[PDB]
């Protein structure tokens, strides 16, 4: 049956776009960091780019160094870079190709639009030219990330009405460039060999329903989804202390929903990750945690590792 | 400054209450809890709890379906919930428009506009107080910048409008509406932003970033809910290595939070063993926003959650 890990994705030589998403606070940032690290360690001759498309960025916080609109290598690694788009500064560097920039810089949607433009300018870079091999997206929570992924479709339909209107109102080739560019992006996003969406969730009632809507929504967009990370699991029966009323009670809830998840998502890689005692922060800890996306965590075997994170 | 939201809960001036914070810290749980407390404490006022998170969870929280039209919470006389579906709202007023980024924030802004108008006219389906279960930090900031953003935007449009049905008047009409929202949103007695957070590293810096940003918009925040606290030293169970180690970390940051935000109502809420859903469990949970949670005394409530 389907192995409970991301080993196939981590060692993949075909995927160019990897979206990590899900409900607020399930562990998208933690998971996207971990996936990006595993791919980087697993494929040393490739260059990877982890971009946060969440307007409230946490990559800088997680690694303990400042990232921005321009990609920077993670300190300590040779092939992993991070980026956190700043709408104001990104529009400024077009401002200083300056009112326009700041105005549009705060309009709702700007963060989704500039993330999309990042994809666009990456497509143009690949064709002509040496750039990042695989790009992993630390996305915003469900609601807005769905907007982002509708954009190839949304812009395509818009650019049809736009063209026939702007030509009679009153440069036309600039439309065709984007119109074709958007298409290219949609082709790659609906290609399961080039693009995939890794869902993150927690085994709690409120995250269950939202995760299922999300997955269905993505499938409707012809977006490949075949992996689900169930994060922050207690595995209370393996503590070998078997006490703490709260932990046993919460694990009972988790385990219950974990059986429901297992049953519905039989055809998905269902990757189960433990709630750690320490902080998943800094290169070392993120790396130590990431290994369990590659080789499934065993509560009986690797039980001590949740207590072995630096402080 | 007392570690509770009693004054906000019993406030008779506030019209706009934003409940926000990082993803997954407890915005939805807290906003429901705040809305119940206020509705219970003020039975003569009508309360509306609106979700501006495109991934709505109010319906899931209460266990009943809500929509764009306000509906009363079953079991409450003066609390209603609203969850606007963009594609379905525009159909009443273009499905591609319902998929455009920012459309969620726009329709939410229009909803605020509808209510200030009806409140001004003393006519129409109205609510005395609107509480917002907001999207996470990033997009909520975009929403609260909208009065400033739209203001500048309508100025520029003025010129390129005069470039070529008496349209200038409608721009002027919008400028005025926006201006009324800006003054109400920046009035500390009418509007406040309640921050929800958890005592963890990634939450601390984002929360601080958020508050500093809200203040630059002349938005009031004097309330911070620190949620999902373990209180391990009070569990009466001095074991479980994970809880002890996790609590030691929570407690460490908790001292820092308490020191920095001394001017704020710092409300501490426990991690529950049960599920906080349904009116009853939400009501029981919400009591600790009005009267601070004593881990030594109120500890039983952690397991008293209906299932």
């Amino acid at each position, epitope marked *: 049956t389907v192995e409970p890990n991301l080993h196939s994705l981590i060692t993949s030589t075909t995927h160019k776009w990897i979206f990590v998403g899900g409900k607020g606070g399930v562990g998208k940032t933690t998971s996207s960091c971990s996936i990006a690290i595993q791919m980087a360690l697993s494929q040393p001759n490739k260059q990877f780019l982890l971009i946060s498309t969440n307007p409230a960025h946490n990559l800088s916080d997680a690694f303990g160094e400042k990232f921005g609109k321009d990609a920077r290598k993670v300190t300590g690694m040779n092939n992993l870079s991070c980026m956190e788009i700043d709408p104001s500064a990104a529009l400024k560097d077009m401002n200083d190709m300056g009112a326009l920039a700041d105005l549009t810089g705060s309009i709702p949607g700007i963060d989704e639009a500039l993330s999309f433009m990042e994809v666009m300018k990456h497509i143009k870079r690949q064709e002509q030219g040496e750039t990042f091999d695989t790009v992993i997206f630390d996305t915003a929570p469900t609601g807005h990330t769905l907007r982002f992924l509708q954009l190839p479709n949304t812009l395509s339909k818009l650019l049809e009405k736009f063209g026939e209107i702007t030509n009679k109102l009153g440069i036309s080739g600039k439309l065709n460039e984007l119109k074709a560019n958007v298409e290219t992006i949609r082709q790659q996003f609906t290609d399961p060999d080039l693009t995939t969406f890794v869902c993150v969730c927690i085994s709690e009632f409120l995250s269950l*329903y939202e995760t299922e809507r999300l997955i269905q929504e993505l*499938i409707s967009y012809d977006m490949d989804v075949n992996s689900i990370i169930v994060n922050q699991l207690l595995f209370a029966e393996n503590d070998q202390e078997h006490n703490c009323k709260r932990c046993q009670a919460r694990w009972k809830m988790q385990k219950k929903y974990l059986d429901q*998840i297992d*049953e519905l998502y*039989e*055809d998905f890689h269902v990757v189960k990750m433990p709630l750690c005692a320490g902080e998943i922060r800094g290169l070392n800890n993120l790396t130590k945690f990431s290994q369990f996306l590659n080789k499934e965590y065993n509560p009986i075997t690797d039980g001590k590792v949740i207590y072995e994170l630096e402080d | 400054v007392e570690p509770n939201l009693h004054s906000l809960i019993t406030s008779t001036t506030h019209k706009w209450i934003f409940v926000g914070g990082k993803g997954g810290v407890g915005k939805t749980t807290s906003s429901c809890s705040i809305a119940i407390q206020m509705a219970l404490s003020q039975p003569n006022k009508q309360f509306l709890l609106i979700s501006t998170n495109p991934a709505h969870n109010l319906s899931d929280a209460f*266990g009943e*379906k809500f929509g764009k039209d306000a509906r009363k919470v*079953t079991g409450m006389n003066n609390l209603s919930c609203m969850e606007i579906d963009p594609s379905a709202a525009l159909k009443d007023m273009a499905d591609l428009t319902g998929s455009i980024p920012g459309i969620d924030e726009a329709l939410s802004f229009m909803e605020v506009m509808k209510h200030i108008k009806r409140q001004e006219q003393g006519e129409g389906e109205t609510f005395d107080t609107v509480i917002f279960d907001t999207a996470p930090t990033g997009h909520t900031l975009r929403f609260l910048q909208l009065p400033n953003t739209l203001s500048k935007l309508l100025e520029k449009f003025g010129e390129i409008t005069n470039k070529l049905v008496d349209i200038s008047g409608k721009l002027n009409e919008l400028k005025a509406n926006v201006e009324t929202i800006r003054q109400q949103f920046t009035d500390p007695d009418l509007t406040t932003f309640v921050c929800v957070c958890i005592s963890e590293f990634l939450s601390l810096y984002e929360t601080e970033r958020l508050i500093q940003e809200l203040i630059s918009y002349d938005m009031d925040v004097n309330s911070i809910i620190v949620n999902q606290l373990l209180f391990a030293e009070n569990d009466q169970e001095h074991n479980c290595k994970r809880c002890q180690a996790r609590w030691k970390m929570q407690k460490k940051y908790l001292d820092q939070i308490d020191e920095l935000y001394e001017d704020f109502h710092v409300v501490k809420m426990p991690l529950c063993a049960g599920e906080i859903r349904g009116l009853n469990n939400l009501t029981k949970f919400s009591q600790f926003l009005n009267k601070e949670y004593n881990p030594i005394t109120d500890g039983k409530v952690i397991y008293e959650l209906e299932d």
Partner: antibody
Amino acid sequence: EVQLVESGGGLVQPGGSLRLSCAASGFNLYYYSIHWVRQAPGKGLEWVASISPYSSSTSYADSVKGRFTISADTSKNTAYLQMNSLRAEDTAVYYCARGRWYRRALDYWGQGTLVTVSS
Amino acid sequence: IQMTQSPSSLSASVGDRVTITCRASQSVSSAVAWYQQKPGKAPKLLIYSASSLYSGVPSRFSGSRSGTDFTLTISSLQPEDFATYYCQQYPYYSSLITFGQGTKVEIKR
């Protein structure tokens, strides 16, 4: 104590309308999916409609799509089936049944209500 | 799109092992359930997920999957096991519910 109770079945002339009701108890239907399955005389089971309040999604069999409408009042813990443009073929015993968000198999059923369509 | 249930009827005696087959037009993974319907009564759920036995159902009932072929096996017919049986598919990629035509298991004498 989980159970589903149908009602509203009766005789309707072709082209007419009829509203079926499925009262649920023992659970909150909001968190579940509710289905209508019918059975023509001497025939087998035929799914006609589903509703899942927790996703705002509804679904219809082609044979009834556009003519029927499924809905739910979550405050009354009751689901409904509005049948318009009825025909002789629509004659059947109509069941309501329950499904789960992770399992679209029907675990609980009502006793069924008889709808007959003829002039 | 169309679930073919066979045979449409079958005679057997108490103690016989019987097998009912349902063939799916397309791959629906393991999302098939089996029901039992007695005259005048609502169907009862027996098996879901092709092979998982539903709560309260006796152990003589069994289900297996072989590709798009699904089987319901009653290892040793009891007097009460005689009824009509329906398979049902509920594929993850769809919101459709599709039943087989049914199998009427009757007593041989």
